[PDB]
């Protein structure tokens, strides 16, 4: 019964996707200024 069942739904891999578009804009602004 059940092969594993991972923890984290809608907030497991979808939570850093809001930070990864916040951190991509800060990495470009720090090199060109």
């Amino acid at each position: 019964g059940s092969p594993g069942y991972p923890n984290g739904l809608l907030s497991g891999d979808e939570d850093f996707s809001s930070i990864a578009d916040m951190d991509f804009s800060a990495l470009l602004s720090q090199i060109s200024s």
Binding site: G4, P6, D13, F16, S17, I19, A20, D21, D23, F24, A26, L27, Q30, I31
Partner: protein, 87 residues
């Protein structure tokens, strides 16, 4: 739990190149000095965490390296949503 080839094959030097494989797919490095930045270390803390979830879930070297590689193509999707549709 039975130990396979990957367990005696994975080093402390691999786990650093697995994260350096992860940080290059999320954001490519212009300068080697960008790796010592504050904002860069924040998602390094995202990728430092995931490797240990592959150690409990994967039983092979091809699955272990695949779970880290699927986030790599899956994060490339979201950067493409801002590129074509800007949303």
């Amino acid at each position: 739990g039975v130990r396979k080839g990957w367990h005696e094959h994975v080093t402390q030097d691999l786990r650093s190149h697995l994260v350096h494989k992860l940080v290059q797919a999320i954001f490519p490095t212009p300068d080697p000095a960008a790796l010592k930045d504050r904002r860069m270390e924040n998602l390094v803390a995202y990728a430092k965490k995931v490797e240990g979830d592959m150690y409990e879930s994967a039983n092979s070297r091809d699955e272990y390296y695949h779970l880290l590689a699927e986030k790599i193509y899956k994060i490339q999707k979201e950067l493409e949503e801002k590129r074509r549709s800007r949303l």
